[PDB]
Design a protein around this ligand. Sequence first.
Ligand SMILES: Nc1nc2c(ncn2[C@@H]2O[C@H](COP(=O)(O)OP(=O)(O)O)[C@@H](O)[C@H]2O)c(=O)[nH]1
Length: 423
Amino acid sequence: GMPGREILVLHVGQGGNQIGYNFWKTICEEHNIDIRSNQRKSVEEDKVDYKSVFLVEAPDGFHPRALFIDLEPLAVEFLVKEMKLGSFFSEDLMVLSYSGAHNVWSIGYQTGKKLIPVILEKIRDTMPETLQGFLIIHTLGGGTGSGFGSLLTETLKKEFPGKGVLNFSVLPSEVNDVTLAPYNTVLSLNHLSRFSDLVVLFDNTALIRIVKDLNYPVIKQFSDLNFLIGRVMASITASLRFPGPLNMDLMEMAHNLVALPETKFIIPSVAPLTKEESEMSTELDLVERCFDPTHYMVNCSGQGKTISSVLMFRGNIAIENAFSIMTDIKSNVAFAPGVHPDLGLKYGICESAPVDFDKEVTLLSNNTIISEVFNRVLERFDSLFNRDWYTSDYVNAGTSKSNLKEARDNFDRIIKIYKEIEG
Ligand SMILES: Nc1nc2c(ncn2[C@@H]2O[C@H](COP(=O)(O)OP(=O)(O)O)[C@@H](O)[C@H]2O)c(=O)[nH]1
């Protein structure tokens, strides 16, 4: 392996760790590595491969440069026992507790604070000095992924200010989720806005909606939603893992999207999503679908105004078709007022292809429509907070109702900043 551009992935909470199954299986397969054996799949290899960004090449084989962190052992049992991948998800990478968070952001933040010294100790003793930053994968509706996840985002940014903190954060289902989810989401999004460098948001609602609206993208609960999430957040890391015009590090990835410091929440969009749709689709259809608010990984009523946008062509793409397609797509994309006609969209081609598809198009967008998504989160927060509903356990866990209001008001400040850019 060649030193540099090493990323440490931190899976926090049950959802974040369960997503790691297909996140690491996709990364392993796309780099010709078998997750069961920790070895390569074939002697066939590209001359240049940036597998060292997410994978450690030990003499025995390849291991994930990752920590699997949870206040309960249920998710790691899914990985080691149900998935039988204990050789890859090994115990030296596991920071585990057994108290739990009980779906309360505050309990995850407080209980996880007792695990921070051992986490920082493992990072210094095991990570390389050329480590470029951290990638935090977690959900926002619970307590461990939200509270401990907010703590790790904050702690890593403070202890490693020169490194990048990237967050792949999963939003709760708007219509079917725990009652404490709006409190946990607002608390987590407030912490992430302060300490994260880039927050790419995923919504279980959006993924469910695509199946419900038939090629079948989920056939079993969670085990296919998380399967699909892990493949998407692995697809949007291809810029960090493969050479090409859009080859980036974590800092570059945030700079291409974060115009103002408060505008750090990104909507990802990937096409194709199923093998049937891939066989019967073209490059133009995948791009037009990525700009379609239906295929947004966040649930959006319509498209908004684009501030900054990064699109990637993966696989067998004709570069002249890519040039001609993006000229026509840019004319029909609504950009935020003040964005230069040729400065709001970046496209690139990656030769490496996803395992299941010959082609793939990914879109990362800093879009003003996230204010609409955040306003729905805000109105669900206010429907409960203004009646003092479900607030008793945040109080007992060290988060006052005043602190809940502070995170809400700052969360609303982010919405209004996005809305001003929209005009
Ligand atoms: N999309 C998706 N959401 C999940 C998954 N696991 C948990 N969640 C979501 O996370 C929210 C509650 O957080 P959870 O991770 O279960 O509890 P935690 O252990 O305190 O982080 C709920 O809205 C769930 O929908 C998962 O595998 N996929």
